[PDB]
Design a binder for these strands. Structure first.
Lengths: 73, 128
RNA sequence: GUGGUUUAAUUCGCGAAGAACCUUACCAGGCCUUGACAUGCUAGGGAACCCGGGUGAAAGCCUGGGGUGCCCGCGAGGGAGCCCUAGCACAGGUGCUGGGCCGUCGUCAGCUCGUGCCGUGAGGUGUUGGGUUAAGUCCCGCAACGAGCGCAACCCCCGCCGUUAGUUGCCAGCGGUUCGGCCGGGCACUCUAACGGGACUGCCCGCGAAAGCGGGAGGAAGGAGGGGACGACGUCUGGUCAGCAUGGCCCUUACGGCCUGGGCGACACACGUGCUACAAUGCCCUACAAAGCGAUGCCACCCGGCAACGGGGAGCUAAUCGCAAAAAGGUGGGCCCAGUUCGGAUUGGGGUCUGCAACCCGACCCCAUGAAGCCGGAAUCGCUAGUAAUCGCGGAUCAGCCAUGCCGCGG
């Protein structure tokens, strides 16, 4: 059905419970955004490219890119 | 080269008993479907007999005969050339049906007139 | 794909690499004895290994319990297989250039050798002529004579005949009709496989160097039966790291090794090649035809749905020992517009799926979408036989994950 990183939510679930709007990082594969990203800077990290973009309540349901770019950059 | 190769020889069609018939059907032939082009000719002839009352065979042979260029001509090329204009001229006719355009193109050609016959007069006149 | 753009924008001199998760490219990080994996050896200590938690998504590192066999052997030590640590070479390197292997290009016939002669410096004579011609050198005559380049040129496949075998595709006479299949019986027939026979220079005529070719009859494919396949040497002196090996340099063990994550070979302009695309097609309905290659994968078959897909049961190791792909293009009939012809790329919105996911590269369906009803002057490309060409089909996409690569056949 719906996919989601089984971890980027562990660090955000606390922020959503504490009230802190820090930036969460990811290290899996198809890192996807979820409703819990309503007010957080999903600034993932790995070692090269970055995938930030502060998701809101409408920017959720997609991503930033790179994993299927018919283009690049 | 040499041996003069061959050109093969086919049989009649059905209600006409002539070789030039199928040969002409080969011109109207397109996409490799002779079955279609076949009926297109038969139906084209049916319209002739239903509009002139004359034999659709005597009108066909005569038409092609009034197209075979004398100058520009081997007794064979006279056929290949004639069959060309007969199809090209019939390809540029007002009638919407293929069998109808050809039918008219044949009648006019048999009467010494039309676009196909007009083309010949030009080739010959521009050759003499 | 090339030039070019560019944080590197795969590699090499149109295409393939069989399908850009992926190695080759970049940044960052960890380890670097073992060096992701494997083989061999030395030194000290030490008994492999198994189960599991957290950190963790670089798997690095940290911790607990149990903890194999053999001789000397009796309560505990050495040593070997084995583990850890320490060291080294092979290892590893699409990191490059300069034998050999595979293969392409000139694709069709010609070249080479021995004896002898001319005859000397050598070379040539072994095609002078005629007709027919892509490999057992086309043959004959005249020529000095002869031979080889190596059993595939019919060796294999399709079309002819005969014989044998296999029988859910099949079938003449006959009965039961199980409501259309079908059963019983059936070297006859049709299909597949195996072997041999027919195979062009034979019967007759014309010229005859009788070398040969041409025409006709019998037969009927036959003097071309079609295709696959193929030569000293030369050239690209490459490519080839698909495989293997040598030498120089690099590899100094921190891109001087290796591993993972993430990404990249998208596009603005232009060319070359291929595919779909209106003027005669589309839509709907009934419905007999076509071969070859498949497959524990596919998957006929009730119901639900536009489709995809989904729920349940059964069948399979194989087509004359189930079956799927059925259907089907085509063809026939009717019909809507006297240029959206309803062909329809692409982009965009929603939903769904194999798959971890692919949500921005996939695929199917629905609405919109009209580049638009054009089909090209100089020049140029492919093919000519039941070929070109038109159209549809099927398997694997056997060299991995639904993103028209190849081969086979019929009309």
């Amino acid at each position: 059905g719906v996919f989601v990183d089984d971890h980027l939510l562990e660090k955000v679930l606390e922020l959503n419970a504490k009230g802190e709007k820090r930036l969460i990082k990811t290290w899996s594969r198809r890192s996807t955004i979820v409703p819990e990203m309503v007010g957080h800077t999903i600034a993932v990290y790995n070692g090269k490219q970055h995938v930030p973009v502060y998701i809101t309540e409408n920017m959720v349901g997609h991503k930033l890119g790179e994993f299927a770019p018919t283009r690049t950059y | 080269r040499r041996r003069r190769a061959e050109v093969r020889q086919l049989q009649p069609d059905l209600v006409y008993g002539d070789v030039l018939v199928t040969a002409f059907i080969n011109k109207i032939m397109r996409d490799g479907k002779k079955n279609l082009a076949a009926r297109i000719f038969y139906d084209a002839c049916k319209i002739i007999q239903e509009k002139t009352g004359q034999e659709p065979l005597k009108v066909f042979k005569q038409a092609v005969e009034n197209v075979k260029p004398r100058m520009e001509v081997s007794p064979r090329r006279q056929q290949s050339l004639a069959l060309r204009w007969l199809v090209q001229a019939a390809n540029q006719r007002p009638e919407r049906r293929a069998a109808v355009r050809i039918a008219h193109e044949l009648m006019d050609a048999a009467e010494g007139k039309g676009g196909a016959v007009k083309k010949k007069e030009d080739v010959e006149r521009m050759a003499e």
